[PDB]
Design a protein around this nucleic acid. Structure first.
Ligand SMILES: Nc1ncnc2c1ncn2[C@@H]1O[C@H](COP(=O)(O)OP(=O)(O)NP(=O)(O)O)[C@@H](O)[C@H]1O
Lengths: 563, 205, 583
DNA sequence: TTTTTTTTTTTTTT
């Protein structure tokens, strides 16, 4: 019950595939490069029991040669085989193995080249540890393989093996206790995130809060609720919002990022690739695959158009995406935040634009990403000199020595710690979140062309999924009224960034005409003019000629009611 | 053998050329011996091969030295001559036309090895340019999937290939010069500039 | 060893007279079951083996292979005491062996897992038909009888040889459960006897069987080294499992006796949802299916329900559809288009090398007797949408490609979810102004589900207090029960109306259509009328009345009413006052 | 005692 496997590492020097020569045979060597086509693992004979050999020799050992046949060699005595082996499989101990062909890396290879590459076989428990696309340190063992010479009583080639492979190519919570003491690490975690960006404030938070997880769980029975969080940041190009995005990929784990129109469609969707060839239906990932459980990023929704808009929105509700070309029936685990930034369809604000018509996209995918968090970037003279101050300090190669209060990597390990929390407010002061959410829609109630949306029933779930991450921020669980208050108002800005029964229609517009106009003007002149712009917007949503006339004689009848 | 380690004594011949006053003009006039006037072009293109410096920070950064430059004017300016020239001087050069460019065209064709029957990742015209200088014709005339590899490397300064068997998002960093023409091809006197440059001013930003 | 005969002596004890949950051995009940079911497939709980002796259970980790060989041979005996027969019936039964974790997935497998019992699971993929295996060699004499083979038979004969089923099945791990970056490495799995052909292409399933390798095998030149290929033969198979039994069902009818069970299943269908009791009615209504039903030897009409759910942003809509999957025994989730696998075309592809064209079923084929679910009709091309309109008419699919005349059978009910043109509420004008989809494909659907709204105050305090109460986890029928429920009734109960009280719906349909002229058109058809009975028959199946009571209609009718009524524009102010008598 | 095989038709797809 013992078979021991040797591995040697930290080898003298990395050698190229172009460096591969016959001298290296039977010798240790370090090489690294990209995977191609990992093949399924199938056992190594090592030793076998095969016998008899005519008729039972039961001889069990060795036969470890590379064929691997056969036993039956020089048995028993007296069995005199020759004969059958006969193969005895059960006593044979097996191990591993899979063939993985490595490709030579692009950065080193001298274009035009077309890198010439051979197989790395994984013999040893070091098998399977590899992942496609990565470069990895290997152990040499040049040797050779059978399919120019022939053994007269053949053809050979390079077979690369490694007895050892690495994928290259504690007390810091005591740092974290020190960090989880302060009140101030809440604002600290904020000014410490992206130095490459200046100002923009609240939006920063969400980014963090995006890397931070939500509940993304329960409550049965039934569907998994969200969970997650989502942000589409917008503003006039030159905004320097993209500086956020490279910060996503340049900070966050397993970050997938593409802005392009061309994915294409599938894309985050599967292709499906046909012909493979040979029976085909080969299912592309595509795109978002390793993106699963990660922060996905896009630019310029104008430049992904409308075709795929809701097809990447499958994961924005179901959180998983099935994919149909008339391929084979499938569904895919997508669970991810999707953050992005389109440039506004006017290129600017478009103050007046309700953000709904601001985006050039549909509420199902729009209402779902919460929340957008508008930033318009403008000139201001001081600010022109402050952009000429700090943005300059970024322009600066030096001083680039200005630093955040948090070392970036310690912020990451703080997250990897903050990713452990599963904070839950069961607390009865979530009653306050009701009133809040109630008063969240009491205002958006009119106009329905306002921030509404509604705002969406999902924005209650969103209201929750905000304080989910607020908790990981403050590291305590069960949250609080203050915590959600943060997030609620925090929505409230970017919903305000969207801002710029006979007599129930009459007392509607009696105080509504003044609601849109008595703040922006006098609410004066005559009584019947208030009727005349109303014969404009009344006729279009009324459902008869009779419902037109009670939009007439009632706009008469309430006038002589209040006159 | 064929159809560069620097010697020491011409290095102080370099600094000798450095004390020479007109090296900013001089080398430029040595850039394009074929072309008359347009000295701001030789000027710029001089500074193109000297373009920028690497900022690696602690992390992120990598704004590089990379500089794109557009040029255009009256049709056939001898722009294609400076492209066809500078293209050849370069350690890694790149050149193509408008309408001869698209998204699918310049990155990772990932074709089969053919004769050995094995799919092997191929570098597209953009991966090889990584470092050095690209060149193209008439950005007004580029297709819609064209610019989709551009929106991709201008800032990302990388390229993302996850498809088929193997996944790599690999870097591309190089300065670039595309020749072009106004829509006219005369851009006509007066007029607002943006439309006259074709394209929206957001894309030109 | 012969000492294992003594093992065989005790396992019999665990195998037959063992009892669980206050007597009533699962054994005697199943033996008796088939038995009466004579399906010669016996199923064994590992729940029990661990509890009693964990030494027989570790025997599954050494060599389960032959352990079962005598094991089932005892069950036979144990079954024989119960049924002194089967000498004339099958004369052999092998046990199924329910779940034994393990709980390994796919790609992680080691040679240490060979010859020892292993549970596996994954999604069904391209499969062969059934070829009978040879088993025991036997002839007229004529050398003698030989065993064979799993599978060698080395190192010529036979006549009366006892044949058995054999089917080889390539199964691949779910693209959904696929770890990222990876290609779908896959496994070959053998099926025998009752286990044969049970599984069906494209579904998640459990394969219980042990691993085989041997031998060389044939790869060789692709390796250069000894490699014994991966094959796994399943001692049993279970889909991603549930079926009713005698006791559950006998209690289950005791639910069916009470008046308001129909009412109960209403509040049960949206357990975490709340939302509107309005729609769920039509949801479990559709979900319950209906009588086929044939008029000899002609058209079978339709017993299957066509759901159209109009959408609205932020409405529960996309959340409700997916309840039906883990609800339904059988379903296919297609989303809308863009799309979700598959695009619902039934295609035909020529197989590798030299073979003529194999026919791949449209996901509907996967969904037969079940229900197909779609959302977001704004996102469907006019290309893949065509064939939708087909299935709900013929209850089948007929495609184009290429070289083979065929027909199929599609019994799929259909749940339509689609977001309104543009944003929230679209036609203050007639709702015909709402849908982008053509009316021919619209009226095809029997239940027109409208959702809302422009904000109301109190109802959201209602739903959302309920919501912040829902998320707190981190009258409804128990959910195990209601799936067992609708399914139980869908394999059995077959409702019929009597013409006596049902002329009333000819006259009252006259009432439901004469002024369906009064405002707009249509979205009625004569199919629309046809569907009403299909709505009632379902509730009858929930009441398990076996034939339609008058009230069973009142359900259906009342549904149809406001299914049409708020679907009408504000002019529906009048349309209310007419359909009153249809209350 | 084993030998030896890539176009043409159609398809589903951005
Ligand atoms: N009773 C309820 N009413 C409304 N929303 C609910 C209810 N219960 C839960 N929700 C939540 O509200 C969300 C709204 O989902 P839904 O409106 O269907 O997304 P969607 O608008 O359909 N996206 P799309 O299908 O593209 O239009 C659900 O996913 C739940 O998280």
């Amino acid at each position: 019950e013992r078979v021991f496997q040797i591995s040697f590492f930290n080898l003298p020097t990395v050698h190229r595939i172009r460096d591969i020569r016959s001298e290296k045979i039977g010798s240790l060597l370090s090489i690294s490069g990209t995977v191609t086509r990992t093949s399924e693992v199938r056992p190594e004979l090592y030793k076998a029991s095969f016998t008899c050999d005519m008729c039972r020799a039961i001889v069990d050992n060795v036969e470890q040669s590379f064929k691997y046949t056969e036993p039956t060699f020089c048995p028993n005595p007296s069995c005199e085989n020759r004969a059958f082996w006969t193969l005895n499989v059960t006593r044979s101990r097996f191990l591993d193995w899979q063939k993985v062909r490595i490709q030579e890396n692009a950065n080193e290879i001298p274009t035009g080249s077309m890198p010439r590459t051979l197989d790395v076989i994984l013999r040893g428990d070091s098998v399977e540890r590899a992942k496609p696309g990565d470069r990895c340190k290997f152990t040499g063992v040049e040797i050779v393989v059978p399919d120019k010479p022939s053994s007269t009583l053949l053809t050979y080639k390079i077979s690369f093996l490694a007895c050892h492979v690495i994928s290259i190519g504690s007390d810091e919570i005591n740092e974290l206790k020190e960090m989880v003491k302060d009140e101030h690490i809440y604002d600290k975690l904020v000014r410490s995130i992206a130095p490459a960006v200046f100002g923009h404030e609240a939006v920063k938070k969400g980014i963090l809060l995006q890397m931070l997880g939500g509940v993304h769980k329960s409550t049965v029975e039934g569907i998994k609720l969200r969970g997650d969080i989502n942000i589409c940041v917008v503003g006039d190009p030159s905004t320097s919002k993209s500086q956020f995005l490279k910060y996503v990929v340049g900070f966050a784990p397993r970050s997938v990022y593409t802005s392009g129109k061309a994915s294409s469609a599938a894309g985050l969707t599967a292709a499906v690739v046909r012909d493979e060839e040979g029976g085909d239906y080969t299912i592309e990932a595509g795109a978002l695959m390793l993106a699963d459980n990660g922060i996905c990023c896009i630019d310029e929704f104008d430049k992904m158009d409308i075709s795929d808009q809701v097809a990447i929105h499958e994961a924005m509700e179901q959180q998983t995406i099935s994919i149909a070309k008339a391929g084979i029936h499938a569904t895919l685990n997508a669970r991810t935040s999707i953050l992005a930034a389109a440039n506004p369809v006017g290129g600017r604000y478009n103050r007046k634009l309700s953000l709904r018509g601001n985006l050039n996209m549909t509420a199902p995918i729009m209402s779902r990403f919460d929340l957008f968090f508008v930033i318009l970037d403008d000139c201001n003279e001081k600010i022109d000199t402050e952009l000429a101050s700090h943005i300059v300090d970024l322009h600066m190669k030096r001083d680039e020595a200005i630093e955040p209060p948090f070392s970036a990597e310690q912020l990451r390990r703080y997250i990897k710690y903050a990713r452990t929390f599963k904070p839950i407010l069961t607390k009865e002061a979530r009653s306050y979140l009701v009133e809040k959410y109630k008063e969240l829609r009491k205002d958006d109630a009119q106009g329905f062309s306002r921030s509404s949306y509604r705002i969406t029933v999902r924005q209650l779930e969103s209201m929750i999924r905000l304080s989910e991450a607020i908790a990981r921020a403050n590291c305590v669980d069960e949250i609080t009224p203050s915590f959600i208050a943060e997030a609620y108002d925090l929505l409230r800005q970017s919903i305000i960034r969207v801002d710029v029964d006979k007599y129930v229609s009459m007392m509607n517009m009696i105080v509504r005409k003044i609601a849109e106009v008595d703040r922006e003007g006098a609410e004066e002149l005559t009584a019947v003019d208030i009727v005349d712009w109303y014969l404009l917007q009344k006729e279009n949503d009324l459902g008869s000629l009779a419902e037109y006339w009670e939009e007439r004689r009632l706009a008469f009848k309430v006038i002589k009611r209040l006159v | 053998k064929v159809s560069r380690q620097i010697t020491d004594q011409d290095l102080a011949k370099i600094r000798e050329v450095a004390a020479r006053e007109d090296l900013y003009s001089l080398l430029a006039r040595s850039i394009a011996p074929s072309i008359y006037e347009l000295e701001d072009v030789k000027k710029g293109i001089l500074l193109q091969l000297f373009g920028g410096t690497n900022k690696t920070f602690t992390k992120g950064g990598r704004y590089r030295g990379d500089i794109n430059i557009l040029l255009c004017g009256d049709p056939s300016t001898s722009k294609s001559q400076i492209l066809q020239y500078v293209h050849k001087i370069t350690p890694r050069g790149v050149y193509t036309s408008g309408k001869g460019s698209s998204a699918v065209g310049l990155t990772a064709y990932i074709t089969r090895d053919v004769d050995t029957k094995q799919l092997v990742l191929e570098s597209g015209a953009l991966v090889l340019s990584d470092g050095g200088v690209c060149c193209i014709d008439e950005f007004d005339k580029m297709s819609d999937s064209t610019r989709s590899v551009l929106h991709e490397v201008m800032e990302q300064q990388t390229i993302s290939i996850a498809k088929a068997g193997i996944i790599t998002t690999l870097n591309a960093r190089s300065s670039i010069l595309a020749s072009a023409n106004p829509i006219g091809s005369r851009y006509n006197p007066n007029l607002p500039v943006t439309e006259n440059i074709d394209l929206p001013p957001p894309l030109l930003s | 060893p012969n000492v294992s005969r003594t093992i065989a002596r005790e396992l019999k004890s665990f195998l037959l007279e063992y009892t669980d949950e206050t007597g009533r051995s699962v054994y005697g009940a199943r033996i008796r079951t088939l038995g009466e079911m004579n399906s010669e497939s016996l199923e064994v709980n590992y729940r029990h083996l661990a509890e009693s002796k964990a030494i027989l259970a570790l025997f599954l980790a050494k060599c389960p292979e032959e352990m079962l060989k005598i094991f089932d041979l005892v069950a036979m005996e144990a079954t024989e005491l119960h049924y002194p027969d089967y000498a004339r019936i099958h004369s052999e039964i092998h046990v199924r062996i329910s779940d034994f974790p393990t709980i390994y997935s796919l790609r992680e497998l080691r040679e240490s897992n060979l010859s020892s019992l292993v549970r596996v699971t994954g999604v069904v993929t391209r499969r062969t038909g059934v070829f009978p295996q040879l088993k025991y060699v036997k002839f007229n004499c004529l050398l003698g009888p030989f065993f064979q083979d799993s599978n060698e038979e080395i190192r010529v004969n036979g006549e009366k040889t006892v044949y058995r089923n054999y089917q080889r099945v390539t199964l691949q791990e779910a693209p959904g459960t696929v770890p990222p970056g990876r290609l779908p490495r896959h496994r070959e799995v053998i099926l025998l006897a009752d286990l044969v052909d049970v599984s069906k292409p494209g579904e998640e399933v459990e394969v219980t069987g042990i691993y085989k390798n041997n031998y060389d095998g044939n790869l060789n030149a692709k390796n250069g080294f000894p490699v014994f290929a991966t094959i796994i033969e399943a001692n049993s198979i279970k889909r991603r499992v549930f079926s009713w039994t005698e006791e559950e069902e006998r209690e289950f009818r005791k639910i069916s006796r009470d008046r308001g069970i129909i009412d109960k299943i209403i509040s049960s269908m949206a357990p975490s949802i709340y939302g509107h009791r309005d729609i769920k009615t039509a949801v479990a209504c559709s979900l319950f299916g209906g009588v086929p039903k044939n008029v000899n030897g002609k058209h079978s009409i339709r017993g299957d329900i066509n759901v159209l759910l109009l959408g609205d942003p932020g409405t529960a809509k996309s959340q409700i559809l997916k309840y039906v999957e883990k609800t339904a025994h059988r379903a296919v989730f297609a989303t809308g288009q863009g799309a979700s696998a598959v695009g619902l075309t039934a295609s035909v592809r020529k197989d590798p090398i030299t073979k003529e064209w194999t026919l791949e079923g449209g996901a509907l084929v996967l969904a037969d007797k079940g229900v197909c679910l779609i959302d977001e009709f704004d996102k469907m091309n006019d290309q893949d949408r065509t064939s939708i309109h087909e299935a709900m008419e013929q209850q089948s699919i007929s495609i184009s490609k290429a070289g083979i005349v065929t027909t199929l059978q599609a019994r799929c009910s259909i749940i339509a979810a689609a977001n309104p043109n543009g944003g929230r509420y679209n036609s203050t004008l007639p709702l015909a102004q709402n849908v982008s989809l053509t009316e021919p494909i619209l009226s095809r659907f029997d239940i027109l589900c409208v959702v809302r709204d422009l904000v109301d105050e109190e109802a959201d305090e209602r739903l959302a207090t309920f919501v912040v109460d829902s998320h707190v986890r981190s009258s409804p029928i128990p959910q195990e029960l209601l799936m067992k429920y609708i399914h139980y009734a869908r394999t059995k109960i077959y409702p019929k109306l009597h013409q006596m009280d049902m002329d009333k719906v000819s006259r009252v349909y006259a009432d439901l259509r004469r002024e369906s002229i009064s405002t707009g058109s249509f979205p009625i058809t004569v199919r629309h009328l046809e569907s009403i009975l299909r709505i009632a028959e379902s509730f009858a199946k929930m009441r398990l009345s076996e034939f339609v009571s008058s009230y069973d209609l009142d359900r259906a009718i009342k549904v149809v009413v406001d299914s049409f009524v708020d679907a009408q524009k504000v002019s529906v102010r009048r349309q209310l006052r007419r359909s009153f008598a249809i209350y």
